[PDB]
């Protein structure tokens, strides 16, 4: 194994979008090599675009990553079994495939599966086709739904055989009960059980839609279940469809570490989505709630002082928290990220902003900032010249002001005359953390 | 992938027998994806010698060849883990595995199967494990034999997915009826159906035995079903066992092109057997019958002169064939191997013996010799000292005689005084090929 | 050899900064055998960090580049094994090694040298150790300094024998007078003579220090001898040490083509320094003086429009240059980097700033900025929000102002109220490049 | 290291001339990798045939072998220093190179050396040029011979650096005294000291002559110093030249294990010489004396019975050695190989022929056979049908006779009538070793 990595990495060291690939490699250097990625795909894409999914899969595996790919044959089977016939039966709320449809789906996927594995190989990747035997599942209903079952135990045995070898495990979605009765698993129950078993770092659904949509119909650049979910279920414009995947993605992530994430995208924007700070697709985390409030008394000072000591590096001076006045407060449920407003000549003033190393990487330091600006469109703050984080402040503000030691910033459509006054004030505020 | 294929020629280009690999392999340009090779193995070898088969399979695939390997779990299943949980195997005709044994064989082979695929990768080969879903088979008997079935249709779909990628398709021996009923195919019916479907160039069973035996117990260097089979079934020393595989191998080849062949061997002699003109193991063809004749006139001279020019390397001098007298003639149907007797002072005398490089390797040069000695127990012939073949002549004869240039031989329980005369004649006979 | 060269492109073809290696390397198609790179190192690094230099050298050579490395044994010889047998080094001008120290330095470097070549091979590189016989040198002083000499003629014969084979020629720092008298060249005179002989494109000293320092003690991101040198010698904070290497590096480059450049760095920042437009270490060129002017007329417009089309990517609108008013103009001699001031309400205003990709990497875009600020302590300019350069503008300014599309900047100790006016002007100024 | 071998060997397994290359590889698998081969070369070959030596060297190294090559510049310097001048001085009995010739030979060889290393690389091999620093040597005479010295200690340090890397160490023949005085070593003293230090298995001198000559002028297919040497020094036709190399080669081998050998040949016959059982060049061993005699009483029976028990596998029946009559006896000094003649109806009869496994491989079983036939041109013997050694008997005889169990052979221009009688006798002789 330590053979392909070294160079594939001495590569990744110098690039614009490199720092965030070599490290996946090191993390899953070994053993959790498949713990890299799960990836679902609706029947359509593989059919109408056999070639793009394929071009994609071969980049992850060559980089050291390991897609463990799963596919259904929505459209090729959905339509191919009507050519044949006896296609209708969807008993409870989803598809019943009675004894007659068994041989079709085998033969179809298996056809396609290879089509995909070979499509994968065509693209320069390495992969193993693993189209039977992954899902042990119990058939739970004999009469009604016909011949459909449920994932009870997972033989990861096979995937690892492909992966260990640097192959993308291309699991199709069929299964065998443990006595052998071949069964059709609708792929979602499959993906879960699977994501469960594997604990990948990322899980993606490839569709032709290739992004998800807001009220205005634009692509959705991230969700945060932790906060967003309830609302999100509960809006009309959110069409029937969009409430359920969200149900399911919350479980998928509710059952993985948070360190996990998710996109849903079209193959073409696949590149821009995993490794950049904008992108084109939906990434979904569970992320964490933010706690708000104007009520300095509802917050844990012992604990926040405990938050602060770790982010920056100093403890607040004595008698300080008592003295703080305070306008509005944002603490994410775990007291590892927080934002605080005092006031000044009417201007909302950012007093302290502290995000622990773990929180920034989860992309949380960043949700925080967001309720803070939704609430304060006109905002002033200051900052040490070296706080290497200054750069994010310049990217976001509509104002700046630098002296040797300190730099006062502002964010709002104000003209400097106005600003100069509170700003002058801002340079004058004293240091809140002790000495240099 | 970069370093592999290349660092295989400018490697085997600095040695003596490099032309025979390029020439059997290039001639083995039956890529046809996987139409390369089928390969049975008895349960035993994988167990007691996981490592050998494995070392072997990795040479074919890196060379450009493509073993499509298949395996049962004879001993590992026969014994341990079937005897462990004390289930026990029930035989009616051959083995009945009733509903109880299903989970064991899956779980056992599947174990071992990966054991082998990983054994394969351990050895530096590329392979895919294809341990379920190749054999669609019908369970034909419900009550009696329990849960056992029969190959009706073959999804080569899988093998080609491994092979196409340069993987040794390592199909283990289980199957699914088309409705799904998991079933135990006893491997033979599997291999046939399979070899049927595939039409490989070569098909080899691997066993501990690693060779097959004659009357005297020595390894058997080739058979020729075409001629040998009838007798071969019909000899007592030929033990019960040895009659049937021959029954089956006749079918396997009877159902493949003749261009096909077959070894049965232990991993260790696998090297010497495929690509050399001696070897160590059993190669089996169907070959062709030879018809026996004294009739110079019933033979194709234009064509034999065509056979001779290729074996040795000179053409017969003018007016020769017409001149040739001829006591008796053996040509294998294809005019690529032949043996000819003239006469001399009563002694049957080998005049010419030519077997083309292809025929030698098929083990046919060698059937030819056989009717020739069944017919002439007392025999004389001669030969050049360098004809590197000489060794075989000395292994066989019961006489020799060497002078710098030529060497007269004889094969018969005669005392030199008798012999000396025809022999002296033998040295005297002139060269039949030019300078 | 098969797997190496190839598994280097379809590898660095699936990443963002792959064009800059292909483009500095292909542009670095100064194979000229070894005319690739020279590389000094102080005794220390090889000792305390045998492994780093080593990890480094193996990247150049596998890439197609060819480090011709040279080494002294500063610390290993200075201390241990010279202090061990208690000989001790005698300095008159710099170091005298009288007859007694000969065997030590041979034996020491030669040790270490292999240590490095093997360190090199450990790292997956290819190299040849070339630890005697490169420096033919004359011992000029017999009595005083003891046994020390001077490089008169260079046998590159050896280096090319290692390099031609894809070996990092690892010349250690000993020499033989032409009659044979083994001699200790203090390495500098060696490196010069050597860089002289070789004409590499780049030449780098490796030290623990791994960067060079300014007044404030920060790493120095580039010098420009052409302009900087005089001042540079002539500053007190510039400590004794820092004046001389600069003396020597001026000569080294004064004697190479300008196309040459130079880092001085610690192994760890070696990556970021050669192939990026920021980096971490000292790059030194001779660069060229800039002459200072307010005379629009003394500048080559056809040629500047030629400079501008390349940096940004649009051409100026018609009748423009004629229109341009112009307070002051900085063009580096080569018309590949330039800065221009118009005016506005009294404020010097940066109108255009264009540095071609080549100039940036030479660290020249950056000298330019320098006379521009020495001249205009109070300065205003503007900029697109995306011009990925913006960051440098924010690192420098003492003012900013952002709106969706554009961003007005300023650099001076002014209070926003003053500024707001010219700034409001700044946002108002129209685009100078088309759409 | 275990990287290049495996395949380079799975290669060598099937060939006509293969069994005798893979094993050199295994022997010198590691560590004694340079203990593979030394190789000298006269100035001429590298000049007039830069390309052949070169084509040669690259086959050994690619096969796993490791030539450690040494060269002088006989002709290119011999002639190039007369262009210059002051070329004459050969003080004792060989060449004096006074202070003036130092810079020439450096500069010449070093030129050529690289020429050879590059010639080596041109040929597809891997090599390192190691043209200074191998020979530490003392200059022993200051005034007379000018500036020439003598090999006192050997830094093998360098060779191993090339070899370890799979390079053919191409040592040129210059040296440095330990204080540094550059000196010219005439290459022979160099080769010895070197062969000494290295203990290679084979050592070869490449010349344009490319073989050595007998009385009749034909190429000499092997010598055996052990026996041949005294005579060999002592024959007139043996010209002045041919007595001395033989002096030197005896020392070279007298100071290496016997397991060693030697050819002297032209590059073109280099292929046929190391790996076949004829060849074209001279191979030289020390080999071992053969002891002869008709005197059964001068031989060690306890010991021969000790020889016999190991070769075949049986001990002679009781009272046997006493009974043996005996015509002529050949024992090589070490009692590990022997040949014995009794008589029968006048015909010299080979009674026992036993060569221990070690002796056959030294090629000694084979010298033995040779005095035995020089002495008995008409010879009869017999042999078991399976004694796998039968084949050598057929290659050599001018007669045969096979029955199921035994086979009677003869060697001589006799007609079978004559022979049949002693032969009939031969089949009738009883087994000398006990039962099957």
Residue numbers in the entry:
A (entry chain A), D (entry chain A): 5 to 440
B (entry chain X), C (entry chain X): 5 to 439
Provide the publication's sentences verbatim.
As noted in Methods, crystals of mmNAGS/K were obtained in trigonal space group P3121, hexagonal space group P6222 and orthorhombic space group P212121. Cell parameters for the trigonal crystal form of mmNAGS/K are a = b = 95.1, c = 253.0 Å and β = 120°, consistent with two subunits per asymmetric unit and 42% solvent content. Even though this crystal form diffracts to only 4.3 Å resolution, the structural solution in space group P3121 could be found by molecular replacement using the A–X dimer of the P212121 crystal form as the search model. Packing analysis indicates that the 2-fold symmetry axis of the molecular tetramer is aligned with the 2-fold crystallographic axis perpendicular to the plane of the tetramer ring.
However, in Xanthomonas campestris and some other bacteria, these reactions are catalyzed by a single bifunctional N-acetylglutamate synthase/kinase (NAGS/K), which has been proposed to have evolved from the fusion of ancestral NAGK and N-acetyltransferase. We have now succeeded in solving the structures of two NAGS/K enzymes, from Maricaulus maris (mmNAGS/K) and X. campestris (xcNAGS/K) that have substantially higher sequence similarity to vertebrate NAGS. In both crystals and solution, ngNAGS is consistently hexameric, while mmNAGS/K and xcNAGS/K, as determined herein, are tetrameric. Each mmNAGS/K subunit has two domains, the AAK domain (residues 1–290) and the NAT domain (residues 292–441) connected by a hinge residue, Gly291.
